[PDB]
């Protein structure tokens, strides 16, 4: 009941900010985009950009994934994003994130017709 490229739209997407407003960024949107429901997810990244510029990366430098599959590829520019790791003091179901946020590129996997991504591999 979640098709590969809805579920990543809803790990990885936040076109709504430019940037990571605060510290509590995280905690809040790991809990509405409900990826704190029978664990703490440990990391997650969201991507400040519109889907339609996610969705063009599929197009772009053809690059390995750390998996070893060849269906990764890295977007030309870097993109706003924010980085959601748990920290020490995260304890389900009380989960605890650190927010960090940055301009990278993002490397995403991807499948399908229509052809996009449905794997968050890495940011650099
Ligand atoms: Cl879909
Ligand atoms: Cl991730």
Do not use: W
């Not at 990244?45 to 339609?52: G, K, N, P, R, Y």
């Amino acid at each position: 009941k979640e098709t590969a490229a809805a579920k990543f739209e809803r790990q990885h997407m936040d076109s709504s900010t430019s940037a990571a407003s605060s510290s509590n960024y995280c905690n809040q949107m790991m809990k509405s985009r409900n990826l704190t429901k029978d664990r703490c997810k440990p990391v997650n990244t969201f991507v400040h950009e519109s889907l339609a510029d996610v969705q063009a990366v599929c197009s772009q430098k053809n690059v390995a994934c750390k998996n070893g599959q060849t269906n990764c590829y890295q977007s030309y520019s870097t993109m706003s994003i924010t980085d959601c790791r748990e920290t020490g003091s995260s304890k389900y179901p009380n989960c605890a994130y650190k927010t960090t946020q940055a301009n990278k590129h993002i490397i995403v996997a991807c499948e399908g017709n229509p052809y996009v991504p449905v794997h968050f591999d890495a940011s650099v």
